[PDB]
Structure formats: C-alpha cells, structure tokens
Amino acid sequence: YQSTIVPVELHSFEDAQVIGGAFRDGDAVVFDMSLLSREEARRIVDFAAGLCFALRGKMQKIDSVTFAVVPE
Amino acid sequence: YQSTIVPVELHSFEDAQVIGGAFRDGDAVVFDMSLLSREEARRIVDFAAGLCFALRGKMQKIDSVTFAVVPE
C-alpha cells in the first residue's frame, strides 16, 4: 500500500495539529501557508521544526509559502 | 536511577535543541525564557509545542517566562 505525501492548506495555527498528526503517524506532509498571516506562518514553521526534531525527521523549504516535513 | 527534571536557561532560539534533546530522550525539561527577546520566547514555545505533539507529551506554563515539557 502506497503512502502519498499529505497536502495541507493551512488556515490558522490550530492547523499545526493536522501536520502533526500525519507526520507523527509516519507520513510526509507538504503544507501551504499562503492564507496565513506572517505571524502564523512563522508559528507553523517553528512547531514543524519541533515535530521534526522529536521524531528525527527533516524539514524542507520548497518556497516562501510551502514546506514539507519528512519522517526519518 | 532517578530522572530529575532538566533545567535550561535559554539564550537564543538555537537552544530549542537543548530542550528537544532532553525531552526526546524522555526527560521532563523546565526552561527559563527571561533572557530571550519576546520574538525568541514565542519561537521556543511553538517549537516545544511541536515536540510535545510529536511524542504525546504535555506542555505546562509555570509563569510568563517559565514552561515545562513532560513526556507521555
């Protein structure tokens, strides 16, 4: 069974849990921050860095509004 | 062998890895943000929330400049 990257269009910092749940279960996540304020985008990236640290994953910047988190 | 909470006096956002390493190994961490700028304190708390989410831990606010992360 294939494990396609989970795409997430973010709406607020509360959606950090959507990236977190998928990544915690072992899925790569690609997320879009273009509907967020500058403040909330920063918050998401910091939360995602904490996810990656905890589970030994890697965060990749695709562009100014698109990042991916990839499991170990 | 006892597992005493790890106290961390933070100096920059780079010290998120000090909270992260201890919490990832299963230690509770109590950290002080009184030497940080407002910007960096926010960044630390968001990174710590990502750590807690990933490993099913809990973050507790002690006061405006002191928080703890506790493993599951």
Residue numbers in the entry:
A (entry chain A), B (entry chain A): 65 to 136
Give sentences copied directly from the paper behind this entry.
At the cell division site, FtsZ protofilaments form a highly dynamic, membrane-bound structure, the Z-ring, which serves as a scaffold for the recruitment of the extra-cytoplasmic cell wall biosynthetic machinery. Here we investigate the physiological function of Corynebacterium glutamicum SepF, the only cell division-associated protein from Actinobacteria known to interact with the conserved C-terminal tail of FtsZ. Our structural data revealed the FtsZ-binding pocket, defining the SepF homodimer as the functional unit, and suggesting a reversible β-sheet-mediated oligomerization interface possibly regulated via an alpha helical switch. We found that FtsZ filaments and lipid membranes have opposing effects on SepF polymerization, pointing to a complex dynamic role of the protein at the division site, involving FtsZ bundling, Z-ring tethering and membrane reshaping activities that are needed for proper Z-ring assembly and function.
To further investigate this hypothesis, we removed the helix and crystallized the resulting SepFΔML,Δα3 construct alone and in complex with FtsZCTD. Despite a different crystal packing, the two structures did show a dimer-dimer association mediated by the opposing β-sheets in the crystal, generating linear SepF polymers similar to those observed for the B. subtilis homolog. These observations demonstrate that the β-sheet is indeed prone to self-interaction in solution and suggest that the amphipathic helix α3 might regulate SepF polymerization. In our hands, C. glutamicum SepF devoid of helix α3 (i.e., with the β-sheet accessible for protein–protein interactions) remained dimeric in solution and we were unable to detect higher order assemblies by size exclusion chromatography or analytical ultracentrifugation.
